[PDB]
Symmetry: D2
């Protein structure tokens, strides 16, 4: 229907964000991104409504939860991060993306801005029940080593550099695994388990709830397993979840529970990461100077995956500011 057109949205949000890469301005980065994604997303033939975005109305003037978007077409619910990794992008760190998923009405978990435990593994073969948040780290990786046909010492486990991950990092290591640390970007790091050239076999750790819904949306189209659990340390978070319909607070959600039906997923890299290469300036002797975006588009029914590298003309003698929409 609309699948291949969403990638223009992510591409322009990543050009805008790339304008603010290395500037150290989390707010200019996130605003150039929201600006440009909203501007491009009001031009796709959809009757879309932002199920997940930059927050509730009062806080976010643009791409707030509930906002009507799209120019006219099939009725869909929209999940987005105009820029996943505003801090990353502001520093020039790895694993920053612009991300956008779409489903038939009510297909995404209606997730509050709250932490979420995660375990993910890639593979179309026959994984499921392979991965379970209520089981040991050792048992999950023992199963995964069996499924992949490797020694435990070959598995590469990704998680975020935090204190809250210390125990998983220790258990996975004495269990025999290799555990690598990303500063930030667990969307990139979850999807990297099902991304053909990452060096990452498993992702374990806790991070945003929306990041986890968007990553599950990708693993639906790539093929994988993933469990998630929302978590709380604050009655304000519990009321926040109560106000979204969520009553079963310790529910383990599987990939189907997080994204269901005809999902389409699209991302663009802003900086080099686990999953996508970053945006680059190129000057050829042929067509002159241009900017290069690396994008992916994926669909859950057909399961076609498309890797797209786009060349965008730019003089580069006036500021990168003109990449901002």
């Amino acid at each position: 229907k609309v699948a291949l057109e969403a990638v223009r949205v992510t591409e322009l949000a990543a050009l805008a964000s790339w304008s603010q890469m290395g500037r150290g301005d989390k707010i200019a980065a996130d605003q150039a991104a929201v600006d440009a994604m909203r501007k491009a997303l009001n031009e796709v033939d959809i009757d879309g409504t932002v199920v997940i975005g930059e927050g509730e109305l009062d806080e976010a003037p643009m791409l707030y939860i509930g906002e009507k978007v799209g120019a006219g077409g099939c009725e869909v619910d929209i999940a987005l991060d105009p820029l996943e990794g505003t801090t990353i992008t502001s520093k020039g760190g790895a694993n920053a993306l612009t991300v956008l998923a779409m489903a038939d009405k009510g297909g995404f978990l209606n997730a509050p801005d709250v932490y979420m435990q995660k375990i993910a593994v890639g593979g179309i073969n026959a994984p499921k029940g392979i991965v379970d948040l209520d089981d040991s780290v050792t048992n999950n990786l023992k199963r995964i080593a069996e499924f992949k046909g490797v020694h435990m010492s070959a598995l590469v486990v990704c998680t975020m550099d935090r204190p809250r991950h210390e125990h998983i990092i220790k258990e996975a290591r004495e269990c025999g695994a290799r555990v690598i640390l990303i500063n930030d970007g667990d969307v990139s790091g979850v999807i990297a388990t099902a991304t053909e050239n990452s060096g990452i076999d498993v992702y374990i750790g806790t991070g945003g709830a929306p990041e986890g819904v968007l990553a599950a949306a990708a693993l639906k189209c790539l093929g994988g397993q993933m469990q998630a659990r929302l978590i709380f340390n604050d009655e304000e978070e519990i009321k926040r979840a109560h106000r979204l319909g969520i009553t079963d607070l310790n529910k383990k959600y599987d990939i189907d529970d997080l994204a269901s039906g005809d999902i389409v997923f699209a991302a663009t890299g802003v900086t080099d990461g686990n999953m996508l290469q970053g945006v680059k300036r190129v000057n050829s002797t042929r067509r002159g100077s241009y900017a290069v975006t690396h994008s992916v588009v994926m669909r859950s029914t057909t399961k076609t995956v498309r890797h797209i590298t786009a060349e965008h003309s730019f003089d580069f003698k006036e500021g990168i500011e003109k990449f901002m929409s």
Copy 2:
């Protein structure tokens, strides 16, 4: 915003064509790529007056000229070749590819089924007026070794392996320039004059006029210079020209004359060629079996060029012609 949806038309055309590759069938090959091209079009939302279909009128009752393909919207002009080099498809020779192009009402030259003399070079910089058909082969190659800034022994020049070209070859060679030869198709041969790492600087040859204007469209998105002229043997080859809006019959068409306006150009490789790579069978252990297609989509206004590798899920224990509807 008509553009990127064009890519799945050429993707499905090259899949159907790849099904018949290496089987010795010319009719099954091209006529299987035409079916898919059109059944892809007849589920796309566009209104498509066909400028360049297949059969003139008599040859086959559903790929005519004046055909209206798609499903309404913009009424743009749709040039096709659902497979060029369809002998070279049915037994694996290089440079088979499925192409779809479209512009505004005669953005193009509506072309007849006669032969065409062509000279082409690539890369949008400052070459203006550079190649002439009248003017000498040595003079053309001298001017463009000047422009590209290289000694003339470096220039690679490309031609169809026909005896009708023996002069150009010899003369280009007696000029001291390496000259390669294809058996195949001159769309990818001319287009490869502005493709990045093709290893080809110039095309000089006589081939079909449809293929000439399709590569002209490519070249106006990639930014090259081309001159062509239409030639005739029997006077029925004169018939269908004045019966189309032409009486300067030995008119000399420069690049704007074959294609101008807001142009979209989409191609997908069927076999490994000088421009795209062909379809392949891959067995991912993460993803299981699929077929990759290597594709390009571009546009004359923006001059944006997208390279698209697509993973199409397929279980290769089923007949290859499951790709064929």
Copy 3:
């Protein structure tokens, strides 16, 4: 122990050979390739001896059977085709490689410049009974289709566009399997069966015997099965076979028979082909002008396979024939 230095000889050969690409002088093409290759060899610290190659002395090639070569080092037997495609290099055709192979003295089959039946398949775990020249085309294709877990129509079969192959072209096609033709060398074509992104599954064909030994030496490092048999039509060929104690004349030869012990294989693309990419001219605004070469070098002991993209600075405003020296 000279593993990777051999790749420099094939690089120098392919650059000199590229000088004469499509210059229609077969003689100056292979003269340039033999001059470059033999000087590069003489600066490789080996006590090499040229045990495979067409001709003797002043009969066809300049490097010839029984010539001592090198600058000291280990004593080694050298298999060659200083350019297995001087017919295609000066023609402008595909599958032009420069090739070299090294074994312990007595490592290669001493073949008596006679033709050869060849059937080759790729695959790390191919059983050796998997392919048999005494069996039907179709039995072979059905057995390897089983091994690969494919429908026989998925299998792409590659052979040379020669009249003597029409029969196996036909039977292979009545399998509903697909058959693709090359006018060019069969070293490229046999190794493409164990090459990552060649679209070629099986090679069946008759061709020269040096080319068979070089193909066997590559498949021995790459993996996969190959069976070969020398063709003895005349009392003269048989006596040449008895002048070297070849008792059985119908012996079927496996890879271990064709090349045995410690094998080094190295090849460099001259033009685009089934296995390697051709040499190209590049201009980058931060490096400059260089020609790129695409090589493979490999060894049977380690079973290590190295892929070498090399950049050779060259000012291209001056004459193309400076790599030749």
Copy 4:
């Protein structure tokens, strides 16, 4: 015929380093690389003396400054980093590299592991005198943006995330430039200024002085400018500076002073980075299971750069510690 064999050394160190990746043990990782590199290097046909290694006579048992290495051959001064980023590898961070360079006697600055101020830009199109440590961040960035024919806002400047890099980050960002921060690895950060799809124009920062000599070696092969200065900042460092022919401890060193003459540079990636990708496990259905290394070899005389993708066969059902010596 010694140039390329250096890649075998770095590969061998990188596979051993890779055993220890994400294992949390930095001594085990540096020790695995030191042991693998020393063993591999004693196989190489050179009369090498270590001029830059792991430490001095007393501190470092293996690869100590002054050590005679190699099997015997041409007299060379060796500069080594068995493992750059021992911390990086232990945690699976970016820009872990194994590195080896060779030159004639006196070709290297014999640098102790003191800190070094560094500024680096790449380009073979005649940059020189463009970077000065004594100039402002603003003056240098202005000259560089002019030299690249680019707006000041386009330059990506790179430095390590350190408090001692506050001024350069602040000052650089107020000129309008983008500044990106790497956790560690200033060899990969400086060499990225002269690497093709590096998104990095300048490196400004302070780090290891040996890491600076080695980045200088690469840049003499790749083309670029760089200026550096040692910081002997405790009296033992200053006296151990006078102990090696130094007296002007505030001397600025040009690139020629850090690496001059006949220079061979080789490196292999351990983790993904700004210069090289990291080692991966690959499980291919044709080729079997292997570990990919990505390496670069280059020479300053010939300005030849070789990008080397190596496939090292491995049963990944055995411990990854098999990749150790």
